[PDB]
Amino acid sequence: MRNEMHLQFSARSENESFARVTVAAFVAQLDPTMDELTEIKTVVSEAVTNAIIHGYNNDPNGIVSISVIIEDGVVHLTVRDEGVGIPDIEEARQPLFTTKPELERSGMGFTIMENFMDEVIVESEVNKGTTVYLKKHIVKS
Amino acid sequence: MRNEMHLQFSARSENESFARVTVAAFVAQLDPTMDELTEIKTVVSEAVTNAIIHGYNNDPNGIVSISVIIEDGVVHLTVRDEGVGIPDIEEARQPLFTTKPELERSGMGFTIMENFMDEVIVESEVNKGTTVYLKKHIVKS
Amino acid sequence: SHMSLAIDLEVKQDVLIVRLSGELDHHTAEELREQVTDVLENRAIRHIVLNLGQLTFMDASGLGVILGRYKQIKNVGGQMVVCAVSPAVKRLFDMSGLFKIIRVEADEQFALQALGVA
Amino acid sequence: HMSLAIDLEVKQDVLIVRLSGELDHHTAEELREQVTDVLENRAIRHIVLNLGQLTFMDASGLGVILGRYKQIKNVGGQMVVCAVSPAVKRLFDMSGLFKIIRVEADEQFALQALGVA
Numbered sequence: 001m002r003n004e005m006h007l008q009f010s011a012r013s014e015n016e017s018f019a020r021v022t023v024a025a026f027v028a029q030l031d032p033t034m035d036e037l038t039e040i041k042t043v044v045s046e047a048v049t050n051a052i053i054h055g056y057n058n059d060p061n062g063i064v065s066i067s068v069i070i071e072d073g074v075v076h077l078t079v080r081d082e083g084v085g086i087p088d089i090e091e092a093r094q095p096l097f098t099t100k101p102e103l104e105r106s107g108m109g110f111t112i113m114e115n116f117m118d119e120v121i122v123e124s125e126v127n128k129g130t131t132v133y134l135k136k137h138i139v140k141s
Numbered sequence: 142m143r144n145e146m147h148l149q150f151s152a153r154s155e156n157e158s159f160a161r162v163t164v165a166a167f168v169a170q171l172d173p174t175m176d177e178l179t180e181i182k183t184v185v186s187e188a189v190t191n192a193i194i195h196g197y198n199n200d201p202n203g204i205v206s207i208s209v210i211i212e213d214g215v216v217h218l219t220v221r222d223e224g225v226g227i228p229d230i231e232e233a234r235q236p237l238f239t240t241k242p243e244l245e246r247s248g249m250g251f252t253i254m255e256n257f258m259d260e261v262i263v264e265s266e267v268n269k270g271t272t273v274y275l276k277k278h279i280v281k282s
Numbered sequence: 283s284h285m286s287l288a289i290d291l292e293v294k295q296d297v298l299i300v301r302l303s304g305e306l307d308h309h310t311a312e313e314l315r316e317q318v319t320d321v322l323e324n325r326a327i328r329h330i331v332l333n334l335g336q337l338t339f340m341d342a343s344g345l346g347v348i349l350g351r352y353k354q355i356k357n358v359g360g361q362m363v364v365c366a367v368s369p370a371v372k373r374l375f376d377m378s379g380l381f382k383i384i385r386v387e388a389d390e391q392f393a394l395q396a397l398g399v400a
Numbered sequence: 401h402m403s404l405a406i407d408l409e410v411k412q413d414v415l416i417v418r419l420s421g422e423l424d425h426h427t428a429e430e431l432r433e434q435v436t437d438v439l440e441n442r443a444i445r446h447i448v449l450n451l452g453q454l455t456f457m458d459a460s461g462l463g464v465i466l467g468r469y470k471q472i473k474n475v476g477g478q479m480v481v482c483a484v485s486p487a488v489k490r491l492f493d494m495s496g497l498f499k500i501i502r503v504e505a506d507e508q509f510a511l512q513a514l515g516v517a
């Protein structure tokens with residue numbers, strides 16, 4: 001099977017929960033583990049939050065863009081923002097690394113993404129935006 | 142305040158449930174009645190199914206585009222498709238009128254939209270698409 | 283996990299009791315129709331009880347599959363009675379006289395009384 | 401706030417925070433406010449965090465928690481987390497920043513380790 005979904009919303013914190021719910025519903029069609037679902041919910045949270053607090057520095061006029069395509073047991077998740085961008089993507093991936101520690105940011109986001117999914121590709125250009133591609137095969141019993 | 146969302150998805154029957162889930166969680170921020178909610182979910186289900194079985198004739202490759210805009214207690218639903226179009230919108234809206242009798246269609250859909258919403262605008266052009274607008278005031282306690 | 287709609291089919295000597303649980307939309311409808319006509323062929327039913335007590339959601343597609351089974355059972359000198367209708371479902375039935383054609387009973391035991399089996 | 405219910409109870413120099421719901425950036429902001437709010441009106445030495453009814457947590461949870469942790473270290477007190485689901489535990493071990501913070505089984509053991517209960 002092949003099913004695609006595209007969601008666009010305002011860069012607002014309430015919507016982090018919103019995206020988690022939406023994505024989870026869309027991926028439920030693959031009848032995955034509760035852990036697989038939780039992992040997928042978490043990752044969506046990490047990426048969407050990043051886009052909001054880092055990408056748009058909490059400016060509610062920014063447009064977070066998520067798009068999930070599920071097919072033959074694999075999930076292709078994409079979170080994108082036309083925001084600030086990431087200067088050194090390699091540096092930012094380091095566990096515990098953060099550029100906003102005074103905001104109680106733990107620097108665990110990316111480390112969680114890379115571990116809850118099978119593959120993570122981060123692409124970004126300063127001042128253009130950031131795009132996070134997350135792949136994931138859903139074990140089917 | 143002025144939250145707004147846009148969802149697009151494959152024209153496949155499972156996404157009817159999906160769209161209901163999605164629009165609901167988004168409108169949830171307004172603390173609506175159980176009925177008010179049910180009325181909104183119901184109506185979204187009505188228009189999305191129309192897009193799938195009528196506009197796209199069950200072709201999953203078609204794309205249904207939803208758009209919800211919350212603002213000042215009102216909910217503004219939108220459901221469009223670049224499908225086949227409605228020849229006579231006037232007649233199509235009459236209760237019991239359906240062009241899919243062989244598919245156990247009761248022809249109630251539109252009538253349900255009109256009875257559950259404060260306003261229903263159906264725009265349609267043959268060989269272009271159909272866009273249904275639905276305005277719903279939410280009794281704020 | 284879950285099936286968007288749960289379909290419990292019970293056969294009591296020439297009577298088919300269908301209890302639905304969950305959401306009943308276009309997607310879910312096709313499934314129900316498929317499973318019902320499947321029993322109506324493997325067996326000779328003449329009476330149908332549709333229990334919508336545990337039905338969480340229903341849209342026009344519900345009215346359809348229901349009005350379909352009605353015709354189906356009727357065309358065999360049989361009768362169908364719907365029971366446990368939530369206000370929400372009922373509210374849809376009241377949208378057109380056409381649906382006053384479907385007999386609605388309070389609980390299940392009265393559905394059967396309406397069929398002449400108890 | 402939203403999707404997260406906060407239950408606060410003070411026992412002679414110990415703040416008990418009972419969370420129930422989902423904890424993410426948005427909801428964590430409401431938690432930080434409400435808590436540092438008590439820390440301002442009362443002299444709190446310790447904090448016992450009951451995550452028994454915690455449905456979900458992302459990194460923001462690790463953040464707001466370590467945020468309180470600091471407020472307590474500056475007063476020589478300690479923080480105890482209890483009733484942690486495996487999902488939350490995974491984010492704790494994974495961040496590794498919780499080899500510090502004390503973790504107990506239930507609110508009794510936590511309070512007990514502090515001296516109160």
Ligand SMILES: Nc1ncnc2c1ncn2[C@@H]1O[C@H](COP(=O)(O)OP(=O)(O)OP(=O)(O)O)[C@@H](O)[C@H]1O
Pocket residue numbers: 046050051052054055056081083084085086092093096097098099100104105106107108109110111130459460463
């Ligand atoms: N969408 C984005 N736009 C701009 N910068 C981003 C974006 N996503 C991540 N970053 C940058 O990458 C760094 C890394 O990630 P993580 O995602 O680990 O950060 P945090 O948000 O600082 O951490 P945590 O989410 O655990 O609190 C961030 O501190 C931020 O500077």
Ligand SMILES: Nc1ncnc2c1ncn2[C@@H]1O[C@H](COP(=O)(O)OP(=O)(O)OP(=O)(O)O)[C@@H](O)[C@H]1O
Pocket residue numbers: 191192193195196197222224225226227233234238239240241245246247248249250251252271342343346
């Ligand atoms: N998106 C659409 N594209 C093309 N034709 C449409 C669309 N939506 C509705 N129509 C036409 O208008 C008629 C509309 O309404 P309703 O929505 O009442 O129809 P049904 O789908 O036949 O009814 P029900 O939904 O109760 O089964 C349809 O039967 C169809 O002929």
Ligand SMILES: [Mg+2]
Pocket residue numbers: 046047049050108109110459
């Ligand atoms: Mg992050």
Ligand SMILES: [Mg+2]
Pocket residue numbers: 187188190191249250251342
């Ligand atoms: Mg319809």
